[PDB]
Amino acid sequence: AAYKLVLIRHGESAWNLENRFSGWYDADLSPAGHEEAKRGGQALRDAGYEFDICFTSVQKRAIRTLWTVLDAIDQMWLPVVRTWRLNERHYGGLTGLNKAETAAKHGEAQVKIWRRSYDVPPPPMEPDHPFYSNISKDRRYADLTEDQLPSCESLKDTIARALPFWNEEIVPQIKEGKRVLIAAHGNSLRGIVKHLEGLSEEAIMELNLPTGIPIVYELDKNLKPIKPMQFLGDEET
Amino acid sequence: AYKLVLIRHGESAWNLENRFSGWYDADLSPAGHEEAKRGGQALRDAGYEFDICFTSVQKRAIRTLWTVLDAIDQMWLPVVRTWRLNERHYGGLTGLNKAETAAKHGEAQVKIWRRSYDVPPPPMEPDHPFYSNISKDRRYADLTEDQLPSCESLKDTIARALPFWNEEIVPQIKEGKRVLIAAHGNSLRGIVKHLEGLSEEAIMELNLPTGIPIVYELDKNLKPIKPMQFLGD
Ligand SMILES: O=C(O)c1cc(-c2ccc(Cl)cc2)cc(NS(=O)(=O)c2ccc(-c3ccccc3)cc2)c1C(=O)O
Ligand SMILES: O=C(O)c1cc(-c2ccc(Cl)cc2)cc(NS(=O)(=O)c2ccc(-c3ccccc3)cc2)c1C(=O)O
Ligand SMILES: [Cl-]
């Protein structure tokens, strides 16, 4: 096909091990998540993949995944572009809570609604939230407008602020012939995949992208996939 | 009072820093990596914050930057890579140790190259083991036939570093952006020479330390207001 696009979802983070909602909280990779990134990079290296430009979020679990991949494929020299628009979904007031704390505070019914809903956000992260200054006052978001800095996000909100970056910054690079690598997060990558495949809300909500595994798209000149997404890695994985 | 920080990478693999590593893309040794860790160490102890980072396209400088960004929890900063901050290109000498260099070219000529601002070493030719490795490397494929060196005098190195400083770095400093530069001995020499208005003799005697943050305080004209300071103990 005319173009080739590679996606990679970061692996396990330190807060995944505590089953805590991270969202915009800047949790690092766990040792196992770092090893996942190494295996994905090895897979790209074995398959001879070459890139011209890389995009990632401003969160270290995705950035470190990208670094590890670039090291594995000996392409540390590539230009890298970081954007808040590829950040993980913002989980609002759930940020920092674990599974038990979330169920205890909100109840089965409410949490079920948040799980399955496309456009119902979780509660807002208010100024007295333990992570409010950690996230909302981080200087990396200093340049965001008031309406851009979320206090919480539904999946629809996340996709809505990721796709502008796709359309305005990534698509031109692809049509320029650049081989793009995107290292990001489950829900921002969901945004890109929904756009690429024209998926419904129900379908995207059921899509669970594997972690640490290069996801390969073969795209025609209008960026329409010519075949299903392919996963890279030894036969078992 | 603008604040500018430079860091020179440390030791590279296989003793290549004592072997004219030049444009060969040598990685850091474990010890050079530890040096970068100590430098980032010191920058975080001092509470330094940056807004934009510049580095070469050589992995020993890039990995030094990565290690620093990791130590100071600023992995999210924008990073700009450019061949114009690469190490001096040592031409045919690249990869030779001092004894092999003297054996092949003679003590007299080597002393001349050592001392001269504007005399390059011999070019890297196809029989050199790094020739295709460097000159056909994809990362330089957009360079024009005049931009891609086969060899460089120190004059050449500084001449192709300063256009990047002037066109890309200076505007950032003038907007108040706090700049970090992770690069190499001779490309950093170019910057230090332009900053301090040093002579050719003086710049050839300047040996910047490795792995140690180098702090400049600049006025509204980007002239230093005091000598460079090192960060640590
Ligand atoms: O022992 C049972 O009777 C039982 C109980 C529950 C249950 C009990 C109390 C609460 Cl507060 C929430 C759920 C869940 C069960 N399994 S579940 O339906 O698939 C299911 C699993 C998980 C969640 C959930 C909700 C919010 C945060 C995280 C997880 C929701 C539903 C079973 C069961 O049948 O084993
Ligand atoms: O992987 C996932 O898709 C997942 C997502 C969420 C989540 C996501 C976003 C928000 Cl805003 C809030 C929550 C939470 C999760 N764990 S759970 O809270 O305990 C939990 C367990 C079971 C149910 C449920 C619902 C309806 C019918 C039967 C069972 C609901 C919740 C999980 C998960 O891993 O199962
Ligand atoms: Cl980077």
Asked whether the beta carbons of B154 and B204 are under 8 A apart, the reply is yes
Taking Cα atoms as reference points, which of B49, B8, B53, B50 lies closest to residue B32? B8
Adjacent-strand bridge partners of B217: B3
Name the nearest CA neighbour of B4 among B133, B170, B124: B170
Name the residue among B187, B211, B207, B212 with its Cα closest to residue B29.
B211
- In 3D space, the residue among B47, B30, B35 whose CA is nearest the CA of residue B9 turns out to be B35
**DSSP letter string over A117-133?**
-SS-------TTSTTHH
Chain position carrying tokens 């897979």: A43
- Pairing state between β A180-184 and A215-219: unpaired
Say if B79 is an interface residue toward chain A (CB within 8 Å): yes
Instruction: Give yes or no for residue A122 CB within 6 A of ligand 2.
Output: yes
Cβ contacts of B104 within 8 Å, gap of 6 or more: B96
A96: left (phi over 0), alpha (psi -120 to 50) or beta: left
- Looking at the DSSP bridge assignments, the partners of residue B52 are B179
Experimental approach was X-ray
Q: What is the C-alpha to C-alpha distance for residues B110 and B101, in angstroms, rounded to an integer?
A: 8
| Distance from the first to the final alpha carbon of chain A | 25
The rounded radius of gyration (Å) of the Cα atoms in chain A is 18
Who among A26, A59, A82 is closest to B78 (CB)?
A82
Both tokens assigned to A84: 């808040």
Q: Distance from A204 to chain B by nearest Cα, in Å? A: 28
State which amino acid sits at residue A176: E
Six token digits for residue B19: 């072997």
CATH level 3 topology of A1-237:
Rossmann fold (3.40.50)
| Cα gap B188→B186, rounded to integer Å | 5
Which region holds residue A7: left if phi is over 0, alpha if psi is between -120 and 50, else beta? beta
Distance CA A27, CA A57 (A): 13
Residues in chain A: 237
Which atom of ligand 1 is found nearest the CA of A107?
A: 11
B76/A63 Cβ within 8 A: yes
Tokens standing for residue A152: 């919480």
Helix residue ranges per DSSP H, A141-212: 155-165, 171-175, 186-197, 201-206
Instruction: Report whether A38 contacts A32 (CB < 8 A).
Output: no
Q: Looking at the partner chain, which of B58, B81, B138 has a beta carbon nearest the beta carbon of A79? A: B81
**In angstroms, what CA-CA distances link B108 with B101, B112, B117?**
11, 6, 16
Cα A55 to ligand 2 centroid, rounded to whole Å: 29
Measured in degrees and rounded to the nearest 5, phi and psi for residue A53 equal -155, 150
* Residue A232 · residue A214 · CB < 8 Å: yes
* B133 contacts on A by Cβ (under 8 Å): none
Q: What CATH number does the domain located at B1-233 have?
A: 3.40.50.1240
Instruction: Name the catalytic one among A34, A88, A106, A153.
Output: A88
Q: Which two tokens stand for residue B216?
A: 């400049």
d(CA A139, CA A58): 11
Span from the CA of A108 to the centroid of ligand 1 (angstroms): 7
- Token look-up 């890039």 returns B62
CB A23 within 8 A of CB A93: no
Burial readout B197-218 (b: 16 or more C-beta within 10 A, e: otherwise) = eeeeeebbeeebebbbbbbbeb
CB count within 10 Å of CB A211 equals: 18
Q: How far is B106 from chain A (nearest CA, A)?
A: 36
B182 is in an annotated binding site: no
Report the distance separating Cα A224 and Cα A116, nearest Å: 28
Distance CA A117, CA A237 (A): 30
Calpha distance A106→B145 (Å, rounded): 66
Compute the residue count for chain B. 233
Size of interface A-B (CB pairs under 8 A): 29
Structural contact between residues A183 and A65, judged by C-beta atoms closer than 8 angstroms? yes
Q: Which residue has the tokens 């400049």?
A: B216
Cβ(B122)–Cβ(B92) under 8 Å? Answer: yes
B155/chain A closest Cα distance in angstroms: 25
**Interruptions in chain B after residues (C–N over 2.5 Å):** none
DSSP state of A141: G
Spatial CB neighbours of A59, under 8 Å, sequence gap ≥ 6: A24, A26, A87, A88, A185, B76
Look at residues A199, A197, A221, A236 and name the one whose alpha carbon lies nearest to residue A7: A197
Question: Which structure tokens are listed for A118?
Answer: 């496309």
Q: What share of chain A is helix, strand, coil (3-state, %, to 5)?
A: 45, 15, 45
The two tokens of residue B185 are 């001995």
Of all protein residues, the one whose alpha carbon is nearest to atom 8 of ligand 1 is A108
Alpha-carbon distance of A53 to B232, in angstroms, equals 36
Residue by residue, DSSP assigns B111-149 as HHHHH-SS---PPP-TTSTTHHHHHT-GGGTTS-TTTS-
Domain-by-domain residue ranges, chain A? 1-237
> CA nearest A61 in B: which residue?
B75
Strand, helix or coil at B34?
A: helix
Task: Enumerate residues 6+ apart whose C-beta is below 8 A from B71.
Answer: B37, B39, B40, B41, B43, B44
Q: Which chain B residue has its CA at the smallest distance from A50's CA?
A: B138
User: What does the longest C-alpha to C-alpha distance in chain A come to?
Assistant: 52
- The distance of Cα A121 from the centroid of its chain, to the nearest Å, equals 18
A88 counts as catalytic: yes
Best CA proximity match to A125, nearest among A183, A117, A141:
A141
A220 close to B (CB below 8 A): no
Q: Tell me: is residue A126 an annotated ligand-binding position.
A: no
Find out whether A212 is annotated in a ligand binding site: no
Given a contact cutoff of 8 angstroms between Cβ atoms, the answer to whether B169 and B195 are in contact is: no
Spatial distance between the Cα atoms of B161 and B221, rounded to a whole number of angstroms: 20
B177 lies within 8 A of chain A by CB? no
| Among protein residues, the one whose CA lies closest to atom 27 of ligand 2 | A112
Interatomic CA distance for residues A194 and A196, integer angstroms: 6
Q: How far apart are CA B25 and CA A59, in angstroms?
A: 28
User: Long-range contact list for A136-143, CB < 8 A, 24+ apart?
Assistant: A138/A26, A139/B49, A140/A58, A140/A84, A140/B76, A141/A84
Q: Is B178 an 8 Å CB contact of chain A?
A: no
Scored b (16 or more CB within 10 A) or e, B34-62 reads bbbbbbbbbbeeeebebbbbbbbbbbbbb
Q: What is the largest CA-CA distance in chain B?
A: 51
- Give, as one character, the DSSP assignment of residue B167: I
Q: Within 13 Å of residue B207, how many CA atoms lie on the same side as its CB? A: 2
**β-strand partners of A180:** A5, A53
Q: Which residues contact A48 (CB under 8 A, 6 or more apart)?
A: none
Q: Which residues of B are catalytic?
A: 9, 87
Tokens of A175: 């049509």
3-class SS of residue B164: helix
> What resolution in angstroms, rounded to 1 decimal?
1.9
Instruction: Kindly provide the b/e burial profile for residues A56-79, where b requires at least 16 CB atoms within 10 angstroms of the residue's own CB.
Output: bbbbbbbbbbbbbbbbbbebbbbb
| Residue type at position B63 | R
